[PDB]
Write a protein that binds this ligand. Sequence first.
Ligand SMILES: [Mn+2]
Ligand SMILES: [Mn+2]
Ligand SMILES: [Mn+2]
Ligand SMILES: [Mn+2]
Lengths: 333, 333
Amino acid sequence: VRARVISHALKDILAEGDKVIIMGHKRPDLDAIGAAIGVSRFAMMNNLEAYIVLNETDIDPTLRRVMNEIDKKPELRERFITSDDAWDMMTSKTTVVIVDTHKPELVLDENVLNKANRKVVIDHHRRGESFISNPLLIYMEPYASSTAELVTELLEYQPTEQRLTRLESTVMYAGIIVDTRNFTLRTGSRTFDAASYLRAHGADTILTQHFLKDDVDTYINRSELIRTVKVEDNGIAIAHGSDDKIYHPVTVAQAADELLSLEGIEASYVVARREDNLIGISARSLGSVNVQLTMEALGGGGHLTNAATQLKGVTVEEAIAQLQQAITEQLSR
Amino acid sequence: VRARVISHALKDILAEGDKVIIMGHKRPDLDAIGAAIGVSRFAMMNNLEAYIVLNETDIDPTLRRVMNEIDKKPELRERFITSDDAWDMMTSKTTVVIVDTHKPELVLDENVLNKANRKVVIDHHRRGESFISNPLLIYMEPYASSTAELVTELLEYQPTEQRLTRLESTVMYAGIIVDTRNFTLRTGSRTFDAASYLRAHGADTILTQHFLKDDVDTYINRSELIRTVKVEDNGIAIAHGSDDKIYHPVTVAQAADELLSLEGIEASYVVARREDNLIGISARSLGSVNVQLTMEALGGGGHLTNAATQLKGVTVEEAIAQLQQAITEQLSR
Ligand SMILES: [Mn+2]
Ligand SMILES: [Mn+2]
Ligand SMILES: [Mn+2]
Ligand SMILES: [Mn+2]
């Protein structure tokens, strides 16, 4: 019933101003874009005027794959405008809806935020210190999977002559996929209700997969690391890169994450050269083995299930030796 | 709609007999076991007495992880009985419910089936030549994801005091996950509606992950195949094992599955030696390339997205050339 009330109050706020400007966070991912797209359908269902703020430099390679689809459909492509155009078209009666963030310094264009007199915030994160000043409406649900999930709930209570389209529901659906790691994290019954709504409007599994495809080369580098793993009887897994090959930190972190998906692994440590004189270790855990303590013992840190260190002046071999020492230490307490 | 009527018609049939015996197919997977668990909760929501037929020899390694969790953490185990105990227990007033199959010779214990005078069939496969004899109720829905999805909908209409437990809903949920490959196949809005109901009752997505983890050797063998892939500009990918290394057929199929998650791959063909005189090829596609036609051209077959063949007396290099001949013949324009 609470989404129903938010939904009708947002419709009133939007109808009230002269148009709607929608913005997510700097370097938008598919949830910020999908949420923004959902709010522009919200406005349209009510024959209101709405735009989504996006600059060419905001479009990372995952987003470019979405934009290539959006370009095939002008009703949808025409809603996207630059920061400059957004600035130029705003009056004191324009409503800016901020999606998928709540912190002024994270918003995609802070200057557009500063220009605005009427603000709405829809977000699924834990509110901290800074916060959008004087919103007319706040829809925050730190338990929700994603802003797409939140906006999908608002859509249900709005007129249906101008329905969510197939492409639009696919982008929203992909945002939920990215934020939940395919219904693996932060996923509640309401996440599945949002998926059902999106799916009933044609959200396309295959196109979503197309957006999220992995590169062949990075799959092959990640698996070079993994193919070396050795797993001890207590579930401790160690994998490494060879001493004269430098690995991208992103690949090392992924390999560490990927080891946890395999049977029998309680915690993973992946040791790979980072530079000419620098060895990285990425550490992950299911949650029983504390990889933070072992990385701290080696001059790094992070969290209980996710930590790392960088070791100056050692080979990969020596790094592996110092890690085994730290692990033994910790295990004998 | 059909769901509401079937749910009340099922409750009448089950309460009219003296008890309920539930069976899936031989070598049961998680959808068979979760659907059976769901049916037995359907019985208990109505204070009927219900059991599921399972013998020790029916328990594969995946099912064994489920049964270990069931022994350690609930009392679900008492509702599982051997073929013999089921036999000893049935009368002409016992209702046998068949889940997730409809062919007599695939039923877990065909003698239990033949003793039943009262039968019910719930299945999501396409009806075929043989079929259960003279059932009191047939619920066949070929477009549903899974029998777990079908049974979940029936539970929604039943009294709610004796609620589905957390672990019961997890196993039901795991059978959806397996049958849909994590919501990428045969997944409609009703599939998500069933996932919502299960998650609301505590279905644990992390425990589900634990049940399904692949082992390290399989990852490694599989990535040995994936690393050879060559992707053509038309989306056609071929990978292969060397001519002197035998691969497990499961690993070949999984390698072909996994190539479809990579950028630029519309159809994958994985060529690898199966015996000293036999080459296997597994083929998968995202729906634009008909790998059924390709494998039919090489003396095999299967479906539009999933096909295979086996080639006698050739090297993998010979098998590859025959495959490329068939490919360019199939897609020449
Ligand atoms: Mn985001
Ligand atoms: Mn988000
Ligand atoms: Mn099955
Ligand atoms: Mn099934």
